[PDB]
Amino acid sequence: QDLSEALKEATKEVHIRAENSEFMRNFQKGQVSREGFKLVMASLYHIYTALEEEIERNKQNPVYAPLYFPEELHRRAALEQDMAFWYGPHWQEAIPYTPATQHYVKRLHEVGGTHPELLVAHAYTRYLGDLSGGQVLKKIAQKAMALPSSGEGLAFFTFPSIDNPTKFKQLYRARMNTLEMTPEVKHRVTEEAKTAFLLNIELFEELQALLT
Ligand code: HEM
Numbered sequence: 385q386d387l388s389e390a391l392k393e394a395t396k397e398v399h400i401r402a403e404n405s406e407f408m409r410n411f412q413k414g415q416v417s418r419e420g421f422k423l424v425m426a427s428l429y430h431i432y433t434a435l436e437e438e439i440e441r442n443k444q445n446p447v448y449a450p451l452y453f454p455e456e457l458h459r460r461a462a463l464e465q466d467m468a469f470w471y472g473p474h475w476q477e478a479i480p481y482t483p484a485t486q487h488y489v490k491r492l493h494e495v496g497g498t499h500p501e502l503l504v505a506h507a508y509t510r511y512l513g514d515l516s517g518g519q520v521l522k523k524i525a526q527k528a529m530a531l532p533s534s535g536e537g538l539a540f541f542t543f544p545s546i547d548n549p550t551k552f553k554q555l556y557r558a559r560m561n562t563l564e565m566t567p568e569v570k571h572r573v574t575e576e577a578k579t580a581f582l583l584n585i586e587l588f589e590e591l592q593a594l595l596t
């Protein structure tokens with residue numbers, strides 16, 4: 385079974401639980417305000433910063449290299465733009481770093497530094513999502529908060545180097561299937577992907593609580 389198919393099958397159940405989390409359920413209904421949105425994007429800033437720091441550390445490692453797409457996928461630069469937009473010139477000392485966010489970042493550094501063969505699980509979980517539901521969320525955020533078509537405040541959801549997200553995702557899945565794969569690696573990679581989804585669910589459950 386190709387890795388791409390194994391991952392989709394392994395995470396299809398938790399995805400349902402994730403897309404139906406209270407925070408997302410509300411976001412999807414159009415109920416999202418500046419306060420809540422700033423909280424989630426600030427958290428993503430930390431998460432992608434850690435993820436991409438580990439991707440850079442392992443860019444030459446064969447267990448990840450085929451998926452090294454900085455120009456097309458990396459979001460840190462975009463998030464820094466969004467942070468300046470929502471938090472101002474000195475966003476660095478203004479943005480929050482929640483416990484659930486720190487927990488996610490901790491696992492990212494553990495994987496990148498000690499279990500690099502599992503890093504693919506984390507890139508898959510975040511990036512393929514950004515190119516899927518993330519695109520639907522972007523439209524909802526624009527409408528709800530009156531954000532301009534010019535893109536300010538939503539740089540994170542914008543991929544100027546990807547003309548067709550559908551085509552790129554297919555390309556990415558195909559590349560994932562070129563990775564050296566063994567029962568051991570495939571089993572653990574799908575398990576880490578489920579863990580990645582849980583880290584996201586816990587983040588959203590935390591943020592929802594902070595708001596309420
Ligand atoms: C806001 C609620 C969500 C919506 C509306 C949503 C919707 C979708 C849709 C429509 C797809 C299918 C795209 C395709 O087949 O190419 C998809 C796939 C995916 N989503 Fe979500 N999603 C949501 C939440 C999440 C969350 C919280 C995560 C985890 C960070 C996530 C990660 C993924 C991944 C990794 C895929 C790709 C699965 C695969 O093709 O193997 N999604 N999502």
Ligand SMILES: [C-]#N
Nearest residue numbers: 513516517518
């Ligand atoms: C999917 N987001």
